[PDB]
Structures are given as C-alpha cells and as structure tokens.
Design an enzyme around this catalytic site. Sequence first.
Site, PDB file in Angstrom:
ATOM      1  N   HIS A   1       5.913-101.233 -79.021  1.00  0.00           N
ATOM      2  CA  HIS A   1       4.576-101.819 -79.129  1.00  0.00           C
ATOM      3  C   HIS A   1       3.933-101.372 -80.434  1.00  0.00           C
ATOM      4  O   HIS A   1       4.172-100.252 -80.900  1.00  0.00           O
ATOM      5  CB  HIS A   1       3.650-101.347 -78.001  1.00  0.00           C
TER       6      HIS A   1
ATOM      7  N   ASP B   1       2.527 -98.002 -80.077  1.00  0.00           N
ATOM      8  CA  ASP B   1       3.463 -96.873 -80.032  1.00  0.00           C
ATOM      9  C   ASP B   1       3.664 -96.261 -81.401  1.00  0.00           C
ATOM     10  O   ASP B   1       3.993 -95.069 -81.519  1.00  0.00           O
ATOM     11  CB  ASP B   1       4.832 -97.310 -79.530  1.00  0.00           C
TER      12      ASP B   1
ATOM     13  N   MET C   1      13.677-106.124 -81.240  1.00  0.00           N
ATOM     14  CA  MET C   1      12.586-106.741 -80.520  1.00  0.00           C
ATOM     15  C   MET C   1      11.358-105.879 -80.711  1.00  0.00           C
ATOM     16  O   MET C   1      11.449-104.657 -80.877  1.00  0.00           O
ATOM     17  CB  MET C   1      12.961-106.937 -79.030  1.00  0.00           C
TER      18      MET C   1
ATOM     19  N   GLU D   1       7.759-111.583 -70.261  1.00  0.00           N
ATOM     20  CA  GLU D   1       8.267-110.591 -69.337  1.00  0.00           C
ATOM     21  C   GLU D   1       7.450-110.684 -68.056  1.00  0.00           C
ATOM     22  O   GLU D   1       6.279-110.254 -68.040  1.00  0.00           O
ATOM     23  CB  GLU D   1       8.159-109.200 -69.947  1.00  0.00           C
TER      24      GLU D   1
ATOM     25  N   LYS E   1       6.037-109.940 -64.196  1.00  0.00           N
ATOM     26  CA  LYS E   1       5.843-108.810 -63.291  1.00  0.00           C
ATOM     27  C   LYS E   1       4.901-109.301 -62.214  1.00  0.00           C
ATOM     28  O   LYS E   1       3.931-109.993 -62.543  1.00  0.00           O
ATOM     29  CB  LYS E   1       5.253-107.589 -64.010  1.00  0.00           C
TER      30      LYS E   1
ATOM     31  N   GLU F   1      12.973-108.256 -66.031  1.00  0.00           N
ATOM     32  CA  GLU F   1      13.200-106.830 -65.804  1.00  0.00           C
ATOM     33  C   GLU F   1      13.692-106.621 -64.381  1.00  0.00           C
ATOM     34  O   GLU F   1      13.098-107.167 -63.439  1.00  0.00           O
ATOM     35  CB  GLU F   1      11.930-106.006 -66.039  1.00  0.00           C
TER      36      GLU F   1
ATOM     37  N   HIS G   1      11.090-105.503 -61.747  1.00  0.00           N
ATOM     38  CA  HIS G   1       9.963-106.406 -61.484  1.00  0.00           C
ATOM     39  C   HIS G   1      10.325-107.494 -60.480  1.00  0.00           C
ATOM     40  O   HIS G   1       9.540-107.790 -59.572  1.00  0.00           O
ATOM     41  CB  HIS G   1       9.464-107.018 -62.800  1.00  0.00           C
TER      42      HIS G   1
ATOM     43  N   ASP H   1      15.481-106.608 -69.609  1.00  0.00           N
ATOM     44  CA  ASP H   1      15.071-105.221 -69.398  1.00  0.00           C
ATOM     45  C   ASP H   1      15.849-104.637 -68.221  1.00  0.00           C
ATOM     46  O   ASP H   1      15.736-105.129 -67.096  1.00  0.00           O
ATOM     47  CB  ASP H   1      13.578-105.157 -69.108  1.00  0.00           C
TER      48      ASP H   1
ATOM     49  N   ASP I   1       5.914 -99.879 -59.485  1.00  0.00           N
ATOM     50  CA  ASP I   1       6.930-100.060 -60.515  1.00  0.00           C
ATOM     51  C   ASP I   1       7.546 -98.708 -60.891  1.00  0.00           C
ATOM     52  O   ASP I   1       6.903 -97.886 -61.549  1.00  0.00           O
ATOM     53  CB  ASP I   1       6.255-100.733 -61.706  1.00  0.00           C
TER      54      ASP I   1
ATOM     55  N   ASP J   1      10.563 -97.917 -62.647  1.00  0.00           N
ATOM     56  CA  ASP J   1      11.243 -97.789 -63.947  1.00  0.00           C
ATOM     57  C   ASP J   1      12.252 -96.630 -63.951  1.00  0.00           C
ATOM     58  O   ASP J   1      12.306 -95.827 -64.886  1.00  0.00           O
ATOM     59  CB  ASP J   1      10.243 -97.623 -65.105  1.00  0.00           C
TER      60      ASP J   1
ATOM     61  N   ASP K   1      14.143-100.557 -70.217  1.00  0.00           N
ATOM     62  CA  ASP K   1      12.707-100.321 -70.060  1.00  0.00           C
ATOM     63  C   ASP K   1      12.558 -99.367 -68.878  1.00  0.00           C
ATOM     64  O   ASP K   1      12.420 -99.796 -67.733  1.00  0.00           O
ATOM     65  CB  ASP K   1      11.959-101.632 -69.855  1.00  0.00           C
TER      66      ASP K   1
HETATM   67 MG   LIG Z   1       9.692-104.314 -69.060  1.00  0.00          MG
HETATM   68 MN   LIG Z   2       8.702-101.906 -64.876  1.00  0.00          MN
END
Ligand SMILES: [Mg+2]
Ligand SMILES: [Mn+2]
Lengths: 387, 387, 387, 387
Positions: free
Chosen positions: A53, A56, A87, A180, A182, A216, A219, A244, A254, A256, A286
């Site tokens: 991002h 980031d 990406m 993406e 979710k 993802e 998700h 992802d 979520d 991850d 991710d």
């Molecule tokens: Mg993701």
């Molecule tokens: Mn996630």
Amino acid sequence: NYQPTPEDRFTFGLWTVGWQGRDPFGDATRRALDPVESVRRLAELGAHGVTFHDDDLIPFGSSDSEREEHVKRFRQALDDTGMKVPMATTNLFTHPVFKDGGFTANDRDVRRYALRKTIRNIDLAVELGAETYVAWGGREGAESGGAKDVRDALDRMKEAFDLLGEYVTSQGYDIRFAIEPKPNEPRGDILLPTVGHALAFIERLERPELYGVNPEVGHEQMAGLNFPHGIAQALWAGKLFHIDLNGQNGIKYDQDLRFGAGDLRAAFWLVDLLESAGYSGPRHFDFKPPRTEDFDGVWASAAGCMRNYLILKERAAAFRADPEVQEALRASRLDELARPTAADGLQALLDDRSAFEEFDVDAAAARGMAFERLDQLAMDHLLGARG
Amino acid sequence: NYQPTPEDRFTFGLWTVGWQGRDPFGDATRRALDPVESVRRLAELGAHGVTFHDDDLIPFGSSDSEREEHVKRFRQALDDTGMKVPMATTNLFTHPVFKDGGFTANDRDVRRYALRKTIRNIDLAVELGAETYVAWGGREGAESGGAKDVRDALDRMKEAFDLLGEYVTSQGYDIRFAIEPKPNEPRGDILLPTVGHALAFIERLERPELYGVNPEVGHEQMAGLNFPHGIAQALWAGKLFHIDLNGQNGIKYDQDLRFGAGDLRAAFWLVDLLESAGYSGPRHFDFKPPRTEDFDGVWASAAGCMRNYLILKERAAAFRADPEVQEALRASRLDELARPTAADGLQALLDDRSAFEEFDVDAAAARGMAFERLDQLAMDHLLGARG
Amino acid sequence: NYQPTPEDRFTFGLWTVGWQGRDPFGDATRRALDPVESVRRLAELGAHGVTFHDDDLIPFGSSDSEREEHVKRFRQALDDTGMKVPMATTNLFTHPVFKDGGFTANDRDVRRYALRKTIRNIDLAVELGAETYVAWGGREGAESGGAKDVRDALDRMKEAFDLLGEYVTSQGYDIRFAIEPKPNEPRGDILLPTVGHALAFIERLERPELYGVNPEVGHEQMAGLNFPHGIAQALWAGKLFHIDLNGQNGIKYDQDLRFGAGDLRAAFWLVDLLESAGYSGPRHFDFKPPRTEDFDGVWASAAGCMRNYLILKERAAAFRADPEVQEALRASRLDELARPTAADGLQALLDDRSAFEEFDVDAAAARGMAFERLDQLAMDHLLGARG
Amino acid sequence: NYQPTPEDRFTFGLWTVGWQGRDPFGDATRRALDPVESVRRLAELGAHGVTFHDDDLIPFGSSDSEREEHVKRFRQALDDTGMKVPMATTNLFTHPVFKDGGFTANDRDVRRYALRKTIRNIDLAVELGAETYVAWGGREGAESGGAKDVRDALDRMKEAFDLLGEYVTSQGYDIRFAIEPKPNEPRGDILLPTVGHALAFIERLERPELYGVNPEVGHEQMAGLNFPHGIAQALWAGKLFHIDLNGQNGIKYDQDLRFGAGDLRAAFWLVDLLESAGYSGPRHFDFKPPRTEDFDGVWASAAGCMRNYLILKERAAAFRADPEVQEALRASRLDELARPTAADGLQALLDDRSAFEEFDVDAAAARGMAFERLDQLAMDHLLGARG
Ligand SMILES: [Mg+2]
Ligand SMILES: [Mn+2]
Ligand SMILES: [Mg+2]
Ligand SMILES: [Mg+2]
Ligand SMILES: [Mg+2]
Ligand SMILES: [Mn+2]
Ligand SMILES: [Mn+2]
Ligand SMILES: [Mn+2]
C-alpha cells in the site's frame, strides 16, 4: 527439500511480515520493520517480489521531498536483491477520513480525495514495474440498513473504476486492475462481498477488459463458500488476474493464517487447479504472523507459506499422474463432463428418442459415480500414503 | 387489518403448502394435497397466483393421456378461482437419476434427459400463461473436490441455458429465465452459490437479456450475506426477474420459514427496497409450514407470510414519509451519495486542488455520520414506537 | 498398508452403511441392506462391532414374535463373525409421533411413550452385550420462541434421564448413558446443543456418574467450535464415554462425511489427543456414504473411514516422538503449562514481589512463543514431509 | 415515551461509550473520554450504574500515588450523580504480556502476574460496592493445535479461579464471580467458548456456589446458538449472575452493536424470558457505538440500547397478558410441558399399558401443535399489530 526459488513467483505484502500485532483487543507485540529490512529478508528466503500500500511505504501526509526519500531507499533494496514489485494497492481504510468508505463514502469530497490518493499511487506502481493494481474496498459498506443506498453506492463505485480506467488508458500505462472481495469486517457488510459479486460488477464497467479479481482464500471461506470452485469460475471468465493465499478456520473474523493452515484439503484442491490451469501470475501471500510470535516466528511463518504450497504442488502432480487415479477419473466419467451435451444441436436433441421417450431412467439412476474411491485416492496422495 | 388482495401479487408454490413434512430424519406428518384444493384454499386467503414444478402437477411417469387430464383439472380450478400462474419450474433434483446433477451430470445421457424434461415443461408453462421460468440447480455441485471439474461444469451449464434460449426464441415464446442460487444443500457445494455468482454467469450466455435471477431470502443468508444488498445489486444490473420470500435463522440447513420469521430487520429493509424500487413482479413465498403443524397450521402459516409483508410495507412507507426521517437522511448525506463524484471529468478532478493538495483531511474525518440516530428512527418505525 | 484389525475397535451403526440416500430434496438411491449383510461385510473389512437403533433392527410396530425373529438372525450373524455390539440407542425422531420431541414433547402421553420405547431397547442392548446407551435428542427443541419453555423442557429432560438411571440401577445392568449433542437440524434449535451444554446438564442429574457424552465431529463443527478442544474438556471432566467420528465442511447442514474428509487438520489433532490420552472406547463412525454411490462405493467409504484414522494415528505418533518436535515443545513452554501456577499457595503468591511489584512486564512481553515453527513441524509430519 | 429510570437497572461499561473506534484495519475516530464525564452523561440519560476494567479507570503503570487520585475523582463523580458500580473486571487482554493468555499462559510467571493483577482490582471493586466480578478470558486459547494442551489449560484455569475463591472467602468479601464466554476473537479458538462450556467448568471448581456466568448476546450468536435457550439453561442451573446485552448479525467478527440491533426477534424472546423469570440483576450493555459516529452519535446509541429494551419489555408483557395468547399456549400444550412426565414413578410407568401396549401412536401423531398460530400472535404483538 521443498526449497522455494524466485521462479515459483512467491510474493508478500510489506504489511504481512510487517504486521505489528495490533488487533481489536490488544496493542502491538512487535516493532515496525523497515521496508528495506523486509525486502532483504524475503529475498533470502526465496521470494520473487513484494507488494505494498502507499501508506506502507510513504508515511501518510509526507511531503513530496519525504516521499522521494522513502521511495529511493526502497528502490535501492529492490535493485540490490533482484526483487520485483508485481502489484501495488492503495490504503483507503486506515485513516479516520475513510470511516464511511473511500469510493462510496456518502460525502462527495471524501470520494474525490480517495480517487486522487489512488491515482497518485498508480503512477508510483507503474514506475516500480507493477503489472496489477489491487483494490480492496474494506470500508465500502454499512452496519445499518439505512446508511447506504446500495444502488447509489454501486453507481459511485462504477464511476470511480471507470475514471481509473480512463486515467491508465490516457497515460498509456500497461497495468490492469483487480478487485479483492471480502464479505465483512471491518464493516458489518462490505459491498461486492464475494468473487461472484465482483465478477458481475466488472461486466458493467465501461472497459471490462481492464478489470479482474484478486480473490483471497480466507475471504471466500468467511462466507462458507468453496474457494477452489470460486477460483474455477474466475478462471472460466478469464478474470483471475492475481490471487491472495492464506488460511482461515471457517466462518469467523478474518484470520489471515499462513497458507496451508486452516482448511488443508481446500488448499490441496486450490493448488491442483492453479497448476493444472497453468495460472502464471504471482502466488501472493496476504497473511499475518500471529501476534504470539517474535521476529524469528515471523520469518518461520513466511517460509512455511511457500513450503506448504510446494508440498501440495508435489502431491497434486503425483495425484494427477497416478495410473490408478487415471482409471478412477474415467470410472467417475470426468472425461464425459468435458464433452458437449448436445453438439448435434437443438433439433437433433428434440428428435432423439434415446434422450427422453426411450431413456431408461432407472438403469441410469442405478449407476454409481465411484466418487468415494476417487476421493480416498486423493486423500492417500495428500497424506503421502502412496506416490 | 392487513388483509391481502390479489392486487398485492402474492404467489405460492404448490410444493410449499403441499409439503408433507418429510425431512432427512423423519417421515411425513401430513397427507398429500390435491393441487386443485391448494388453488382454491390459496384463493380464499387472498393470493394472486400459484407456481409449480412439473412433477408437482403431473405425477412422474404419467402417460400422455394421464398428463392431459391433470392439466385440464388444474386449468379449470384456475378459471374458477381466477388464480394466475406467473412462474413455473422443473424438478431436476428428486428422482435418483439426478443424483449427480441435471445440466452438469458427468453422464452425458443424463444431461440430455434433463434438457428434454425442462423443454417439455416450458411448453406447458407457456400454455398456462407463465411469464418467468425458474431454474434451481439443486443437484449441480459436489461433495468432494475431484468429482467435478468446475470449468467443464460451467461449460455444460452454459450449453444447457444457451439451448433453452434458442428453444424459446425459435418458438416465439415470451418467457424469461430466472436462476435461483443456493450455496449448499443437498450438495456439499452447489454451483452458482450466490446472487453474485449467478449474475456473473449470465453475462457469458449467448443471449444474456433473456436471463435474470430469482434470489431467495434464506439462501443468501445461508452464506451470511446481506439479502437486501444482494437484491440491490440485482436491481442495479436490471436482473431481478422474480423473488422468493421466506425466513431463515442464520447459517445452517435451509429452513424455509414463513416470511417475517428468521431475520426480521432484514425483512423490513428488503420490503423497503422492493417498494422503493417499484419492483412489480410476483411476491412469491418459497416456504415450508413446519412439520409440527396440521392443515389448519399450514394455512395459518401461509396467511402469516402475506400478513407480515403487509405490516412491513406499512412501516417502511411511514418511515420514508416521515419528515424527521428525511431530515436524518440529509444529515447522514444519503442525498450526497446520489451525487456524481466527478461529473466534471478526469482532467478537472486532477486539476482540483481542493480534492487533494488543499483537502483538510482532519476536518473531514471529524464529521459524524449520524447513522445511529437514523437507525433508531428506523427501529422506532418498525416497532410502531412512532408514526 | 494401514489395514484395520478388530483391535483398533472400529464400530459402525447399521444406519450408516445402511443409509438409502433419501435427503430433504430426493428419493433413495440405494436398496435397503439386511442387517445380517452389513454385519458380515463390516467384519470382512476389519470392523470390531456394530451399533443400532431399535428401529434399524426391529420394524416399528413389530409384534413380539416378529421382534424375536429379527433379533435371532442378527444374533447368529454376530456369533458367526465375532462382531461385538458395544453401544445401542433409541430412534425417537423418525415416526411422526415424535415431531415435537420424545422426552420433551409438549404432550405428556408422548413423553411417557418415549420412555417406554427407550426402556424396552435398553433390555435388548444389555442382552447383546452393550456397555453404552446413547441418546441423541434430535427432535428436542423448537423452530419458534414460544413453542417451548426451555426451563420446563429441561425439567422434563432431567426427569427422563433420572428415570432411566433408576431403571438400570434397579435392574443391576452394567451400562452407562451417553448424550449426543447437536446444535440444530432437524429442529431449528436443539436442546443441549454442544458438548459443553450436555456436560453442564449431566451435573444436575440425580446420579451423574451414570452419564457422559458421545460427541460427534461434525456436530461441534456445525457450531464453528474446535472439536479437539471440546473433546479435551470432556476428557478433563471424565465424561468421554463414546465418540462419533466423521467429517463436516464447516457451518451448514449435517453432512456426515467419512472420517478424514471435511476438516483434515482437526482430524489429525483429534487422533493425537485420543491416542495420547489413552482413550480406550470404541472409535464409532456415524457417517453416510454419499447418495451418488452404489454399494461398492458404500464399502469403499466405510473402509476409508478406518484407513484415515490409521494414517493419522501414525503421523501423530511420529510427530510426538520426533526429537525436533520435542525441543520445539520445550521452546514453546508446553511443559510449563503442565506445572502449577501457585503450588506455594495464596499467601506466598500475595507476598511474591517477583509476581507483581518487581515483574518485568516488558521483558516478558518480548518473549516469542515459537508456535509457528511448532505448527509447521506438525504440518510436515501430517503431510509426510519428514518422519 | 419509553424513558429509562434507574429503577430499570441499566448499566454500561466505561469501555463502551468510551470506545475510541480503533479496529484491526483503522485508527481511532474519537478522542478518549474522561471516566468522570462518562458517569455524568450516563446519569443524565437514565442509567443506574457503570462498570469498569481496572485499566479503564487507572492508566496502566500508575503509581500507588496516582492510582489513589484516579479513584478519588471517580468516587466523587459517583456520589454526585448517585450512580452505582454493580460489577467490575480485569483487563487481561490488551497489554502484549497477555498475548498467550493470562490464567492459561504457557509461561508460569505471566500466570502469577495475571492473578496478582486480578486480586488488586477485586479489592477496589469491593471498596466501590461491586457485587459481581466478571472474567472474560479473551486471550485464553490458541490459533494452532499444538500450542496449548487444553487439559493442562483447564487445570490452570481451575487453579486460578480456586485461588480467587479462596482469596474472597478469606477476606470476608461478599462478591461473586461471573465467567463471560466467547467462542473466538481475538484468539482463533477461546477456551470455555459458550455458556454451556462455562457452566460445566464451574461444577469442577472447589466452591462452585461462588461462580456463575455472564453471557453476552453477540457471543453465543457468533456460534449460531439460540441466546434465549442458553439463558434459560443458565437460569435453570441457578447461575445467571449477570448479563451483557448487545446486538450481532450472525456468525462473523464480534460486532457489539447496540441492543435491539442484530437479531430483533431473539431480543424480544430474551426480554420475555428475563422479565418472566424475574431476573433482578443489572441490564448491562457491552456495546460499541460504531466508529462512524461522533460524540452525539455515541450518546444516541447508548440511549437506543435502553429504549429498545423498554419497547420490547412492553410488547412481551402485552403478549403474555393477552387472553388470546393464553388460549393459544394451552392449544399448543405449553401447560402440559410443565407437567411431570411420571410423578407416579418408574414402576407405575412400566405397568401403565396406556403408555405403550395400548398407546394409539397414529392418533397422537395426527395432533397439530398449533405453533405457527402462536408464533404469528407473538409477531403481531412485537410489531404492535394488536394489543
Ligand atoms: Mg487480501
Ligand atoms: Mn484476509
Ligand atoms: Mg426457492
Ligand atoms: Mg452421531
Ligand atoms: Mg461482554
Ligand atoms: Mn430454501
Ligand atoms: Mn451428524
Ligand atoms: Mn462482544
């Protein structure tokens, strides 16, 4: 054994190994990483590249001079390591200004700001060589039914993506967009909640060929959906631009987790599909190393992500090549699923007494599909109980 | 109070009030209903029309002779009560021949039979004046990952629907198709599991204008999705051809409770949307009176479906007419959401310094959205704690 | 390789391999099995024994003469094969008389009938050598909030179990009871929905030592709960009398897949726990071969059930014996979890400055738990990527 | 209309209206609230009392000097408004030292610190007049299977609670403990995940009479469970010491919506039960005003909690007072459910031929339960479509 190489195309977001461990109920358990540190350590583990991002890499509210300094250090780290940036994406969810969304905020001035923040990072992404630009609308949605007219919000979402497509076309940038999905969190419900909803929405954009999905694992599983099935529909539509990879234990927040954790058999079938379809994009993780871990655990978790992909790739290849699985696939008539139902056409079908007037429905009903033998062969291969 | 009239366009499937109460763990608790008696009893309760599977009306295996008698009786009952038939559908799920699907069975001869069975009932639906033909692919899917290559299955599903579109166009029929999604049950995972997946699939058919969705309240809620949001996206795409109303308590087996039961606030927001959008199709109830009930309980439950819709319609109209609610909507900037973000165009947005360079992000972030006050006004209206 | 033997104590209900494939949306796809057939075929596959509902063995409404004939054939099959009957249960869910429950039906005469039906089958169970009597209250619950006062229903449930405990004590039968929880289906909500609720309820019975739980993998997972955790709490309380093994893909209808399918990593951790705790009861499969299968698929599915247990048993044993897993368990301080927090007692703890006044909270916070390395070692062992 | 008074016993945690809006994906949208200002604003809205974590009132790290000033200010604000403090609790989840738990951390020195931190706040809660001490073990649990031996973790949890019971009894304190269950979040799985698991665990403590449950609406609904049923079982066992009221939309992250939002009919049946049972404890709201809201929205949401309880209380009282409802309850045999099944005893039941040998099972099966008519009367009352 199962050593990743850059050719496996494994990528990691800066925010993944960089996650400091703040969750809804607790403070950070780890210090911030310098992006230069993450690039160098991921290269050493065999990664192909990194993603980011804007926020980031560039502290929010950085002057243009400060922005230049932050990019230059990141730059040099990439040059030194050979790491790619396939990406990039925009943070339109962390700052309080985005509390009702970016592209679909009720306030029009926030929506214009969100587009300008996005366009500015597209320029940077292209400069660093990114081929895909991801959008996760994490604040686009609502907690209550009256706060958001979803037809108006979809108009505003289409407007934003059409303008972004106009921008890249006018600039001549070679970059595509990936949405993406979710289903929820941090909003009570998020717009375009699944792969299916995002694919449908893309078909109403002005230049649909510019847009695909970035599904993802966790998700889709947060909606209890079959992730390999959803990936198959994205591939079928020609829309799998990016993926992802992580893990998730069913329907809850979520998680991850690292790839392989969560639903292991879904991971096996996902890798089987990606490899046999010849998906050639990045295998992007991710994920978040659990906040119980120190930095040694962070790098062990990232390494486990690629190790588990490589183990499953081996087992799925061995599964498809096994002569016994062969015969079992013919016994379950998978090859017949791949043939047209009525290549003779409608009139021939209507005139075919074997398809109705003279069809022995009871004989057909009595045929076993032999799916359980086939599935236990797949189980045996996954567990290494045959080769 | 809250009496239905046929102007309200409430419709019911024969299989709803006719459900005998067999579930996976129990035998029937009620005797079978004569289709003609259901038509008369529904007309007495205020219904506008009835719908049917082929096998609800004509016992499977019926000779061409017997088939004619069954339709003649039913047509006469329709004439006597009036009653419409706005929609019909095919049973491609009960008979054991469909145990691996109809349109996507691995066995090609089953897929051809499924198509022939469907086409025969399309002719009958048209004779009876049906405007919409529904397909619920309840057996299309899988319990295990290797049993179905989903890309091939989507090819076969598209082939089936393209053949059906060619049939109706070649006949000059003025009927449209509506795909009914469901995520699972009776298969472990069903293909096209949500509204979004079905909308995306329709865009890849040969004649997409012939196809829309028939979403069901309880089916989207079986994936934890927001049913009003999914309806809005269907309306936005111009694809809400029909709707199935019932109740469901969250993520579990498909309950098919009467409308109003299950998630009451979601029902309120659904009725608000349907009436605000001016949806003019049938209000169809795909429900099952619980098997605890005798035949008096069956008709009480059917009446409750229509009564609950009418109460919610009243409360949603009062909500939208309330000057205080209109002021709360402006305070939450719902009217700004209906605003183009950048009707001035890409270049103008890029040159607008007030959208980025001079945007006061901290002041914008401080703005409350006033959503909780709006939502409590909506609660008060639903409960009748104001008018 | 991975051949079951009677010593592995694998058992199967008659209703498992006997399931004809009727589901809420479809007719049977398989003929009924003779119980004598199932006994002989399971023996050939290496099973230890079989279980039954009264109605599986004795057609409902059989005369006493007919009952004797049915038991005698079953008898002889058991004698011929060496197969044991370690557990039996009552069907209080299939006949329409049980549509509102057995022990907690609102009608008192149904509740008395349900107890008499149960007591009659306890006699038969003891005659055939059963040590455990299972109760699955599948119809005890409600679809609507007012249909069942749950405090009164729990009184009625306690009353029924107290009377059954009185019966076995007065007869001198050496048999214990096990309650099989399920959160929902076929009722909208079922009483005692999880292992935790059943354990709590047992503590209010007149002779709690007579009662334990029969948890089922898929039922706890239907609530999204961790099955190994729930088994650990049952073992901790001394209440794991029996266990039902199968597979389930998250939160949806009760799938009853073969063991190993569904959540594979949960299966690994479950077998790890059972074997290292020294659980010595039956490993009972409460599963349904999918209705896509013919009888060859039925026996392949049953065989896969025991094969997957044996594979996971090998991997979990190899995991615990690995010197590297050893050290990793010490590195994650699992041995410190097993030591008392305050064996010095309350006063010593209150006077221990190292526990508060002088505790270095930041140094303690900085310690990594090294859980991710430990978990990737477990993943490696499950997948056979080390030995 | 529907104005709260302190006689209604509505209470609020400092951390509820004081939640600053930080979630896993976003920074705070609101400034921190002075505890004294929250006490005054809540008193103005009609609240009876407030609750607190130690760290809500006294900043972590506060010197013994500073701690005294903070309590003195708070006590004065209480005196001025009146306001009660009926309950207090310990924060054993925010600080990174608790990343693997408090009472069940693998590290023994953390477990001793957790106990010392709790005991210090028990003394303060007693000084302030609290009658109930709540423990939510939000960090007790695991993300992976090998990280926690759950039998050892339950031993450590029991050891902790037994030490707390010995402390309060040795001091002569008249305070009781209430365990607050939650199934997951922030840990992948939390120990004692539902009301039932917590009730079972309490029976194995040294002094079980000192311990009960503090169930939360949204937590049981995160496992898909019926919250009114779980409350009934807690009441049946005599263990409902306290309750947390809020709203939750099904199985997802823990939303903490204001009471009334989420599942509206479950809220109605909960209030019906609490008032019918004569629960006399605090009506406590553990909720979070959504982070879209400014401080006006915070107080609107808090007022909405109390208003929604009061509307539901009115509708549930009207429902139970309605002579038509009383007749529908008799028609559904709710009064027979309150009947002993066999007050005549085991021997009499065995000799009663009308309970088995001469029971007309087909006539009993034909009886409708009239549940749907009863439930529609309950719907009409909730919506005010009758009085
Ligand atoms: Mg993701
Ligand atoms: Mn996630
Ligand atoms: Mg339907
Ligand atoms: Mg079972
Ligand atoms: Mg709480
Ligand atoms: Mn349904
Ligand atoms: Mn089951
Ligand atoms: Mn909560």
